[PDB]
Design a protein around this ligand. Structure first.
Ligand code: HEM
Length: 153
């Protein structure tokens, strides 16, 4: 599992995310959409945005970034005891939203990219390994729930 020392690395940088949840949400979602355009087509709410400036100017997009980060945070502060938290999320993402596991890999990479950009003194290799570990545990757990439900395995 993550060691206590790994968990402290993850939560130290996540407390700096919290100082600007909206801004980090925006940057994470923009990166995802520009690097992996197919992901934007999942969002009836956002599929009209074509350019990076249009994405930056959308207030609703910045709201959904907060939604996302606020749920991610709540999961992380459980330190792996996130069964309750995860269960509604994998349920909607398998059945309603239909989000492949691979696209959760891609938002994982955009999280780490942004955190590197924003927090390089608090996001050395040590903390980057720890963050990667904690995002891989989130994906493993959700993947287990998708399998159970019979969504892309
Ligand atoms: C850190 C990873 C992610 C977290 C914590 C997250 C969290 C959430 C939450 C809390 C909601 C609203 C409640 C719900 O319907 O469950 C939501 C909705 C949604 N998410 Fe996720 N999500 C993540 C990744 C993704 C990815 C990678 C995509 C697409 C590529 C996606 C697509 C959606 C869509 C389409 C909605 C509904 C938005 C709307 O129409 O209101 N999510 N997400």
């Amino acid at each position: 599992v993550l060691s206590e020392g790994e968990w402290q690395l993850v939560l130290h940088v996540w407390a700096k995310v919290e100082a600007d949840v909206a801004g980090h949400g925006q940057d994470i979602l923009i990166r995802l959409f520009k690097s992996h355009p197919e992901t934007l087509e999942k969002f009836d709410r956002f599929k009209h945005l074509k350019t990076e400036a249009e994405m930056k100017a959308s207030e609703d997009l910045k709201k959904h970034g907060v939604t996302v980060l606020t749920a991610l945070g709540a999961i992380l502060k459980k330190k792996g005891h996130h069964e309750a938290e995860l269960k509604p999320l994998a349920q909607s993402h398998a059945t309603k939203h239909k989000i492949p596991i691979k696209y959760l890999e891609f938002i994982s990479e955009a999280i780490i990219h942004v955190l590197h950009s924003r927090h390089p003194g608090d996001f050395g290799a040590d903390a980057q390994g720890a963050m990667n570990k904690a995002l891989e545990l989130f994906r493993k757990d959700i993947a287990a729930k998708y399998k159970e439900l019979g969504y892309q395995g």
